[PDB]
Paper text:
All five ebolaviruses express a single glycoprotein on their surface, termed GP. In producer cells, the GP precursor is cleaved by furin to yield two subunits: GP1, which mediates receptor binding, and GP2, which mediates fusion. GP1 and GP2 are linked by a disulfide bond, and the GP1-GP2 pair assembles into a trimer of GP1-GP2 heterodimers on the viral surface. To date, only one naturally occurring human antibody has been described that is able to neutralize all of them. This antibody, termed ADI-15878, was identified in a human survivor of the 2013–2016 outbreak.
The structure of the ADI-15878–EBOV GPCL complex was determined to 4.25-Å resolution, while the ADI-15878–BDBV GPCL complex was determined to 4.75-Å resolution. The EBOV GPCL complex was refined to an Rwork/Rfree of 28%/32.3%, and the BDBV GPCL complex was refined to an Rwork/Rfree of 30.6%/31.1%. Heavy-chain (HC) monoclonal antibody (MAb) residues 27, 32, 100, 101, 102, 103, and 105 and light-chain (LC) residues 31, 32, 50, 51, 52, 53, 66, 67, and 71 also contact the N563 glycan. This glycan is present in both structures and is clearly visible in the higher-resolution ADI-15878–EBOV GP structure. ADI-15878 targets a quaternary epitope that reaches from the base region of one GP1/GP2 protomer to the fusion loop of a neighboring protomer within the GP trimer. In contrast, ADI-15878 displaces the N-terminal tail of GP2 and instead binds underneath and into the N-term pocket itself. In EBOV, I504 of the tail binds into the hydrophobic pocket. We note that for EBOV, it is tacked down onto the GP core in all structures except in this complex with ADI-15878 and a prior complex with its receptor NPC1 (22). In the ADI-15878-bound conformation, the Cα of GP2 residue G528 moves 5.2 Å in toward the GP core, and the Cα of I527 also shifts 4.7 Å from its unbound conformation. This site is a known escape mutant of ADI-15878 (G528E). Mutation of position 528 to any residue other than Gly may prevent antibody binding by disallowing the conformational readjustments of the fusion loop required for ADI-15878 interaction.
Author numbering:
A (entry chain D): 509 to 612
B (entry chain B): 507 to 612
C (entry chain M): 2 to 137, 144 to 224
D (entry chain N): 1 to 106, 108 to 212
E (entry chain A): 32 to 194
F (entry chain C): 32 to 190
G (entry chain E): 32 to 187
The structure:
Amino acid sequence: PKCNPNLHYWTTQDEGAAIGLAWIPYFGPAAEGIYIEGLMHNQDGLICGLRQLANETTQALQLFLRATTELRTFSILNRKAIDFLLQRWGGTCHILGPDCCIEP
Amino acid sequence: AQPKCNPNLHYWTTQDEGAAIGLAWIPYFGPAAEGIYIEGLMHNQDGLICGLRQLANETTQALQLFLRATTELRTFSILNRKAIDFLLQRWGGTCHILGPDCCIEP
Amino acid sequence: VQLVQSGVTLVQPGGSLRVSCAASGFTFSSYAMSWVRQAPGKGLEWVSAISGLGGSTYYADSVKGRFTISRDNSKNTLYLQMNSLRAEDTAVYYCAKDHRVWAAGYHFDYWGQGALVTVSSASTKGPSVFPLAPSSTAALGCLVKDYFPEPVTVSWNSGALTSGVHTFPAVLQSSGLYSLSSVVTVPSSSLGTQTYICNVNHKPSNTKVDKKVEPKS
Amino acid sequence: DIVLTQSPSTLSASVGDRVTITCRASQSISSWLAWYQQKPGEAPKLLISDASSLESGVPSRFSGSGSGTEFTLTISSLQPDDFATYYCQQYYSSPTFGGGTKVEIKTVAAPSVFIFPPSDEQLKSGTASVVCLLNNFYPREAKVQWKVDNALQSGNSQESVTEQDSKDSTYSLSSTLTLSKADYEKHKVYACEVTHQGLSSPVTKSFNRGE
Amino acid sequence: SIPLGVIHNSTLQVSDVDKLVCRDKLSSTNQLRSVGLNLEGNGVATDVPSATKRWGFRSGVPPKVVNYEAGEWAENCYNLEIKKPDGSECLPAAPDGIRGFPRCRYVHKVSGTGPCAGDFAFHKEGAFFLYDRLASTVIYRGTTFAEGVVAFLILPQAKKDFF
Amino acid sequence: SIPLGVIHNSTLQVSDVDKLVCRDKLSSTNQLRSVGLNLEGNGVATDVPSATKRWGFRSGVPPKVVNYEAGEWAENCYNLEIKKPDGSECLPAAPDGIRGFPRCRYVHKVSGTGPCAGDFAFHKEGAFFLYDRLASTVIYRGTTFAEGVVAFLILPQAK
Amino acid sequence: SIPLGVIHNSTLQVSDVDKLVCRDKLSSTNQLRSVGLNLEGNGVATDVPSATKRWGFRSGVPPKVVNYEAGEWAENCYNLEIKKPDGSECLPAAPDGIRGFPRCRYVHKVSGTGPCAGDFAFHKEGAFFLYDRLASTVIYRGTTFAEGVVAFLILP
Ligand SMILES: *[C@@H]1O[C@H](CO)[C@@H](O[C@@H]2O[C@H](CO)[C@@H](O[C@@H]3O[C@H](CO[C@H]4O[C@H](CO)[C@@H](O)[C@H](O)[C@@H]4O[C@@H]4O[C@H](CO)[C@@H](O[C@@H]5O[C@H](CO)[C@H](O)[C@H](O)[C@H]5O)[C@H](O)[C@H]4NC(C)=O)[C@@H](O)[C@H](O[C@H]4O[C@H](CO)[C@@H](O)[C@H](O)[C@@H]4O[C@@H]4O[C@H](CO)[C@@H](O)[C@H](O)[C@H]4NC(C)=O)[C@@H]3O)[C@H](O)[C@H]2NC(C)=O)[C@H](O)[C@H]1NC(C)=O
Ligand SMILES: *[C@@H]1O[C@H](CO)[C@@H](O[C@@H]2O[C@H](CO)[C@@H](O[C@@H]3O[C@H](CO[C@H]4O[C@H](CO)[C@@H](O)[C@H](O)[C@@H]4O[C@@H]4O[C@H](CO)[C@@H](O[C@@H]5O[C@H](CO)[C@H](O)[C@H](O)[C@H]5O)[C@H](O)[C@H]4NC(C)=O)[C@@H](O)[C@H](O[C@H]4O[C@H](CO)[C@@H](O)[C@H](O)[C@@H]4O[C@@H]4O[C@H](CO)[C@@H](O)[C@H](O)[C@H]4NC(C)=O)[C@@H]3O)[C@H](O)[C@H]2NC(C)=O)[C@H](O)[C@H]1NC(C)=O
Ligand SMILES: *[C@@H]1O[C@H](CO)[C@@H](O[C@@H]2O[C@H](CO)[C@@H](O[C@@H]3O[C@H](CO[C@H]4O[C@H](CO)[C@@H](O)[C@H](O)[C@@H]4O[C@@H]4O[C@H](CO)[C@@H](O)[C@H](O)[C@H]4NC(C)=O)[C@@H](O)[C@H](O[C@H]4O[C@H](CO)[C@@H](O)[C@H](O)[C@@H]4O[C@@H]4O[C@H](CO)[C@@H](O)[C@H](O)[C@H]4NC(C)=O)[C@@H]3O)[C@H](O)[C@H]2NC(C)=O)[C@H](O)[C@H]1NC(C)=O
Ligand SMILES: *[C@@H]1O[C@H](CO[C@@H]2O[C@@H](C)[C@@H](O)[C@@H](O)[C@@H]2O)[C@@H](O[C@@H]2O[C@H](CO)[C@@H](O)[C@H](O)[C@H]2NC(C)=O)[C@H](O)[C@H]1NC(C)=O
Ligand SMILES: *[C@@H]1O[C@H](CO)[C@@H](O)[C@H](O)[C@H]1NC(C)=O
Ligand SMILES: *[C@@H]1O[C@H](CO)[C@@H](O)[C@H](O)[C@H]1NC(C)=O
């Protein structure tokens, strides 16, 4: 399987760059220019493995998209955060237990 | 003496993990929207089926007030919000060992 | 590009057993493996499957409750932990690799030799050898009864007679104890002047008995 | 879920003969299908995948066609190595293996019938087993019924069939009737009836108890 | 707070919001499920003339739609083609992503003229109009629907009673 | 459920859902982010003749849209204007809020007549059609898109 | 890092992202609430000529909508019907689910010709346009709105 060791990704980050005065809607940036650039390199494992996960993630994601009746589903990320918290603290947390994350 | 409730519940639903195979999830070769649903039947229990019909009729009252208050045309977060409230009631505040509200057993 | 299963295993009802599928000669993590079991005299049946990454695990409706699948990319080994075993689960288990698709589909080009798992759960006991007297070309044989577990080897005169010997496959009985029958066809005149002794070598029960077959009236 | 069915189970064939196996899935699985090959005691070997493309190292004679529900595995020329069970797996639905197609070679031979009484040492233990032996009979199909005092016996009989012998190409079958010591002594006459294609009239071999 | 049912071993009770029970365990969000139940199956006579009495038109109230993941086979379903004396359409067109009821053994067609006072049609008793995994308070034109109500319950992991 | 990868230090490993590791720390929602990856990285041919063969038309399947926050620069991108002999448009108009791919080095424009056997066009291999932070299974008319798939990972940013 | 205010002693204290206060208790989601506040409270000029000068037309920026549960009674509200010299409509029609402001003491209606060089009309100062429980950055035709800003608070 061919892999690209260099990952040049465009994304937006809310927390990373807060410049100011660009939030005003009249003078705000154009739709094409809001994105920022980043580069990932010098890593054999992290870059190729990411492409491996997304190809496999489509399998489970397709069944989820078919199950939901929403035309646009933005709640995928929020659902995982709930499951993470529910698995640990959802039930009674026993001190020094395997499921419970409590250490005296 | 109370056969108003129907003890047999034949339910149509969707399939979460039901099919573990990986050569059909693709929508092009996938099944039609009408055929994706799976069927199941619950029987020989009077309590579980009748109580389910009892709760939804009562839930409709409180649910209507929520839909009127929210401006969303379609609200899919009702069930997910309940999971948040579940965690918030227990671990939201300071959790005291051997307390009534805190869930911790030494 | 070869997959190695476990050689032999034996269990009890509801017992726990682990099967290790070793993989070497090609990249493991790139492809997704799966387990397939074959019951004696029955077609192949899919047990469980796991994705190449290991995040997604897949089980059959019958197998989802009592079976657990796991794989380690570092060791290139696939572990199937079996819990709450049943008699229906007695089968030769096979592990294979993807034929074409890369971590997408379940096609299998290359299969392992298979691992034998027997859940019958019966106390190991020596076979009872009963000879079958000839009649009147003459046919004679030896009957192996109430033996557990497999295998059972049958040889005539320590292998001196290899020809015209038919060792029939084992049959399961209602009591859960296997039984095997072996026969041989020899001339009628040679029956009187020659002696035929059937050898039954059973390793687990350590029962080796040589029963001569003589016809008398 | 979805379970495909195979029309032929056991197909008689000869060297250099065209062989066609039909595997029809219940639902429409489109083009996703595969065929497998399993020899006795050997791991299954992939014959073909997707019903179009052949695996590397697989002989070119093997071919397959069909789309949607209908599928046909065709072998233009049969070879001695080619005798194995064939299964068809479709990846659309939950994985489902076919009933399997076993390939054999089919002259006609007459079964020899041999019936043996329970041994004397077997009687002392309290269990009596009568064995009826069929040897050197092909074709494979045969039917063995047990008759005790001219009465049919069902459920108390166990049978086993050996594999074809390489030299003479003749199958062998053994049927064993197991009964309690008391039940064996009550009935005087035990008989074994054999029905085969080679024999025009089914031949019956019977013996008398304690004789 | 919207009522939330809990399931116990061969017993079903309701969970109060104020009462905090540490015995209840929620391992994942998959446990939570929304189940629609039709009003037709429980305690009412199914006939076309009675169905028209329950539905009514009202204005000034915006429509609201809620999704329901689980549903019940409906014996009777209704499809509505309704116009005014001038030929105008009383009911609005079905929005994108909304489909007819998946399981209907009998679909009664209703094509008739009516006064239609108001923009949208609402249920007098307050029962929701079932659709494909979406419960709506207003009827949509040319869309098969059933009268039903939605519930929210917690499903146990140890044994599978539902799904 | 949906696979979720975790990165301990400069290596990605995946945690099974049944197992529970308390050493894993989720401090905030910002750690979780969804990353789309284009097929160009996977060594598939980006030529026009192969891309049109992978796409196909299908009916009876409603379209689904999923959002992805991060995406990758695409060397090749495709814009489709396709009509039939009767002049009807096979692909639907782009919905509100959906825009073309932001970063494309080459935008291929293919205008030709062909039959559509379905209402919407889906990818046979199952790859999603990239858009501006909205991934859709169906193609939209006059909107530049890329072929890609989406993944979800956990990043331990602060410690 | 959206700001979140908390009221404990009836005095505002600041929650830094790095800081963690265990004394604050979040019992349920109902505690969290979003409250919009109109610019009228900030002493800005409430006359129509000053409001129309703050608004301006801009293209290339897609509109965004955010919901607010609570709002404030407005003395002055603005409704815009604005076209170009060719009769084309300057502002887009209000989308489904969006309604006018419920509480308005005075609704100023301005119907006039304007340059309208842009796709949408945006606020120079950055204040959101109030709508029935929906705040939008762009103006909608024939819809009563108020100028306001949104906050998020925790209620004990
Ligand atoms: C949860 O599930 C609950 C149970 O299913 C459900 O509760 C239902 O609520 C309904 C509310 O609308 C209620 O319907 C009302 O029934 C009134 C009774 O009238 C009876 O007689 C009429 C004349 O023959 C019939 O046409 C009616 O259909 C009705 O039929 C009989 O009703 C009785 C009473 O319940 C019932 O007896 C009961 O039996 C049980 C055992 O089965 C017990 O023994 C009880 O003790 C016993 O009482 C009979 O079984 C039943 N017959 C049959 C054959 O079964 C009816 O008068 C109501 O109509 C008027 O009043 C309401 C009040 O506001 C108005 O809204 C309504 O529009 C009518 O008012 C007039 O309407 C005109 C037309 O629109 C209008 O022009 C007029 O202007 C207007 N009047 C004025 C002054 O403006 C009404 O139909 C129903 O009975 C309840 N269910 C049951 C089983 O009783 C609840 O809604 C569900 N909730 C959710 C959220 O799902
Ligand atoms: C995740 O990532 C995965 C890896 O990239 C990816 O998996 C890919 O899925 C694709 C699904 O469409 C698959 O594409 C298929 O390829 C078949 C091979 O055809 C060869 O010839 C073509 C025409 O020249 C070439 O364009 C192909 O590249 C291919 O050429 C070489 O083929 C060899 C094998 O013969 C292959 O070697 C394999 O390499 C891998 C590792 O790389 C392993 O080692 C394997 O063991 C080894 O065999 C080469 O890699 C390959 N490329 C090169 C450069 O050499 C092709 O036949 C398929 O077409 C059929 O299906 C499509 C479905 O859309 C139908 O539309 C089409 O009509 C075909 O059906 C048949 O058509 C015939 C037309 O004449 C017709 O006569 C038949 O009747 C009909 N059959 C019927 C009706 O049953 C298809 O294009 C691709 O190969 C996979 N990748 C790899 C590496 O294998 C996965 O999709 C990703 N997932 C996500 C979600 O993104
Ligand atoms: C949060 O709350 C904040 C506080 O209320 C609020 O901030 C407000 O932000 C707006 C932004 O537009 C700002 O408005 C600016 O005000 C400048 C001040 O102008 C004077 O004079 C005018 C005219 O008489 C008065 O009406 C003003 O009130 C102001 O008077 C006082 O000035 C002193 C400074 O000396 C201030 O300290 C006082 O506060 C102020 N008020 C009082 C009551 O005393 C004004 O100059 C600005 O105009 C220029 O900038 C604009 C930026 O977009 C240009 O568009 C505009 O054209 C002007 O630019 C140039 O101006 C030259 C001046 O001659 C021209 O020659 C040029 O042609 C022209 N253009 C160019 C290209 O060169 C602007 O109107 C408010 O003043 C400010 N509030 C306060 C109290 O100061 C936030 O918006 C709130 N945020 C939210 C989200 O709600
Ligand atoms: C739910 O309960 C049943 C039955 O349990 C008994 O009956 C209940 C009504 C209640 O009175 C309990 O206290 C009783 O113990 C369970 O069915 C049995 O489960 C056990 C294992 O826990 C199993 O060994 C038995 O074979 C089952 N059959 C019996 C005892 O009738 C069931 O497992 C429980 N779980 C659910 C929700 O199905
Ligand atoms: C981080 O990853 C590197 C990979 O080379 C490894 O050597 C190191 O032990 C890891 N842990 C650290 C740096 O704490
Ligand atoms: C809150 O502030 C008031 C101010 O009068 C003070 O009296 C009180 O002690 C403070 N604390 C609480 C818990 O009310």
